Symmetry: D2
Amino acid sequence: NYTIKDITRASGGFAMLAVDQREAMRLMFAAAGAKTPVADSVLTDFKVNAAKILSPYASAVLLDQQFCYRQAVEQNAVAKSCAMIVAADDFIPGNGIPVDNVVLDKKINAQAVKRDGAKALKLLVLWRSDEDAQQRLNMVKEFNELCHSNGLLSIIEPVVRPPRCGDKFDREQAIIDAAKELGDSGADLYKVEMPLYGKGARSDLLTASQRLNGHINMPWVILSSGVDEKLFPRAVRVAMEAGASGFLAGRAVWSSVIGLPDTELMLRDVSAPKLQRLGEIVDEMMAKR
Amino acid sequence: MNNYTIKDITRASGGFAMLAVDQREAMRLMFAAAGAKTPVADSVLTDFKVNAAKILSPYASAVLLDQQFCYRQAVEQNAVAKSCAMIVAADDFIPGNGIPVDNVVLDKKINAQAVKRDGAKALKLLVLWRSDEDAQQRLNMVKEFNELCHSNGLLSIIEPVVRPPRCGDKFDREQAIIDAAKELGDSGADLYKVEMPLYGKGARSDLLTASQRLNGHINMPWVILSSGVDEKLFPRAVRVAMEAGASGFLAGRAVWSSVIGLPDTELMLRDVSAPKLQRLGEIVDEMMAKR
Amino acid sequence: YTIKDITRASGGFAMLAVDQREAMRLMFAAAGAKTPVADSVLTDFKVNAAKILSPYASAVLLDQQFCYRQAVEQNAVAKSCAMIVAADDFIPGNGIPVDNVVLDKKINAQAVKRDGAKALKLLVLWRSDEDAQQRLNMVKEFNELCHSNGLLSIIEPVVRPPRCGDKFDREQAIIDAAKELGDSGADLYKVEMPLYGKGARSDLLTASQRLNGHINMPWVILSSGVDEKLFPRAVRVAMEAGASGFLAGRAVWSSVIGLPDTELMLRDVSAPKLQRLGEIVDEMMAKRR
Amino acid sequence: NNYTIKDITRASGGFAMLAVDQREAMRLMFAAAGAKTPVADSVLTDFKVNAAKILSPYASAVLLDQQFCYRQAVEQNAVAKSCAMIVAADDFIPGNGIPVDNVVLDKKINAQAVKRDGAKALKLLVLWRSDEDAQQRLNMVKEFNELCHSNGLLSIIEPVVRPPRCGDKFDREQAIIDAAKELGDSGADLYKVEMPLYGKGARSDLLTASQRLNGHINMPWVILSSGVDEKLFPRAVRVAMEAGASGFLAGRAVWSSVIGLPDTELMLRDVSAPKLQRLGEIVDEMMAKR
């Protein structure tokens, strides 16, 4: 039975790296001027290099079976100090985007990924105001049972989207409504979008983060999608002041080096200092408790 | 009562040189994007649409108006030149997935007899086309629309617009335009309003080949719309589409999008928009003269 | 020589400029033309612009460097359109193509007059810390070159920041140039539009009336610095203030540079804009009594 | 009046130096990043002193200007004791619509006074143009070297290439080489140079261009970051040092990205400091190889 201590820093803070992005990462390579079509091997090589170079600074790394889990294990890319999280979400494209719908990946063999050293699984939950709450709660319950019956931690990631029908979309209220619905759903860790995209006055960001904290009844961390990499360190500090326990971040660490020459040099010189600073901020905030 | 015919919405040459100002929430988003004070009032859309009709209808064989923002106002203010026929939108746009037009149905609130009394000669229906949605539902909506028009002596204009599938990531926009024409190009409407292949970009010879391929699947007169075509490439698009068998255009953005949010709207419609619509009409006559 | 030789029947000026030299090569490069851009690309564009647009112009401004000889030999200039020949020698410097300008000592005024030219044009760069007397002496020499050969003189004062200092008020510089050169005995003053033709019509009219008060010869506006969509309003406002029309290049043809099918684009995109500007000139001259 | 290069280097002998001396060019950066205009002098002063206070702990030296921050940084004890002070001795003259069209020696700099305050070096920008007189540049560098050396200060020269006053022949890469052929043996203590090729392209071409430049410089040399993307500056330092450079003296690649962000002190600590720390680690790694 793994527990939360297995994916945290010695301080108890979460300083976790995400490299599990799938077709969304292929689109990032194309947008940064990579030769199209972008081969699967370009994603695999980047993900394994990111794990190899950045996992020494992370309490856990989130890997996907589609492009990098098997390769990261076989190549010993993950530092012994860094726990493995395996994505258990099956992304369904639609309406011109890579992740229009998400279901539990029926191909994940929890016992097999546990034998390979995984300590946790992760599930994206898309949240829309006009889709049924009970279907989301049932998917989270099935996911929690898959994790807990195999001694793995469950990490859920509710992400808000506009309604299927209608034009009433308040992103800030949707994040609160998702937390009211799923913040006490029996997962081990809640991974949430940062209120206000981490923008604006620190005082308003803290108020919005404290409002969110009040609806989450498990440890929670922020993800970086939608937050400028320069504002993500402040977002971690403010979220943790509000009651968060750290971060699970991808884009705010490595997005800026996609398409630059000398990938391994760029991950070490550009990405690693950003991940190191985020880990130091987590320890500073945990020390204040 | 009046039975309108294609001649009632064409130039003397028989070419179509038609203006669209029926955009609804999509036009509000254009005003916001161009720096208009938010929230953008309905009156800003109405005033722009009526000014566009007043200033540009003298250069158009028909103008497409929406009941939501401008049909009643354009009629009451005599904004439409008598030489310009009125087309009324009969589509009900349903927003979803963060866009203003995610779904479309026939507007059950349109009273065809009432809009005919106000002088309308034609109705228009947007049809969203997706590879994984049922063709029979699209064909049934077009049949009900054709009956609404024809039973009231009005012309039927259909506008198939391709969208990515609801589920999956296989989207070939150029093939989708062809597949929509194979499905709806012989559906008994009076006029087919179609997206320009290749967004009107690239070598003239490739644009002509793509336009001739599309022509082969359309068994009614057809015109091109300008959405997705740079205003500077739209004149060439009209020329190439007409060389391939099209009979003209029904355009909005390529005529007036560039003046949204500029000062002195009436001056801008006259000095920037009108010369572009005038040139498109001259191109339509030049191409009709070659046939 | 008479001003009536370069005006519309109304007496308004509706004139086309295609005399841009290295500045036009930079426009081709910026629009994605294969570099280095050959001289023949400029010549072909200039001659096509003259051939297609001169039917809508009361005069066309040509340069000897790239197009005067070719336009004459190929009968590119409509009989209804007078020829203006540039008499300026552009000197590059400080990373720009036109850092300094002198009278072109190579222009044979008698030879261009025999070809049917009616006018010469001279750019005068105006800087607050350069000597007014040197500018006035160059304008006097230019006026004598024109008038002694029965040609009209068109001067184009263009304001630039000072050689030394950071005090640059573009609107005051335009006024100071007109106070200095607005009664210099040229036949026509070609001026930059106040405020780049931007803002409220009422402020544009006030700025145009202020400029009018300092110009004691007919004056026209040039389009450099004015968005092509605001140039029609700029002509209307300048003429309400006392201007007699325009001598424009960029606001007519800049948008077709680098598009496919150049001749089609000049006819379908550029010509309608030049036609509308001519109609505005006639509308404004008709209000004059 | 003994002076030593060791006073502005890391223990490794590498240079890991911070520049915050930008004047009207920094005001233009604040305006471009959406600061309320006109931008007050106090906005520049507060930013420069905060940058010194927060970043000087990671730098072997900091370059300060008298116009906006030298007096304030000294009075407020903003410079870490481990970080040497370099004082700008250039007087920037605007012209032709830019803030730095011409540069002369600042006749107002009191070398004895800044030395009493603990400064170890002065810095002089030299604008290099193919059609301006080489002898006038060499004479200004000689006067500057004498001002420094007679006061026990190090001399840092920064030749920056510009297009000619007259003509359109401007080869930026050849100009950098011609400036080094002219000034690379001019008796200054340190040569501060623009990175060849803006640090862009294949590492192999960047190294060749850096080795060509190294061959013309007969004093220690460092690269500046102006014109190099902040993400390519770490590779530029590594390649320049492989070619024979001894480190960097950088401003924009450290702090430009935080201008106009909220919570300036937090942003300098969380965004700027990690970049300066990594550059210092790269300098030590490269000095260890030699």
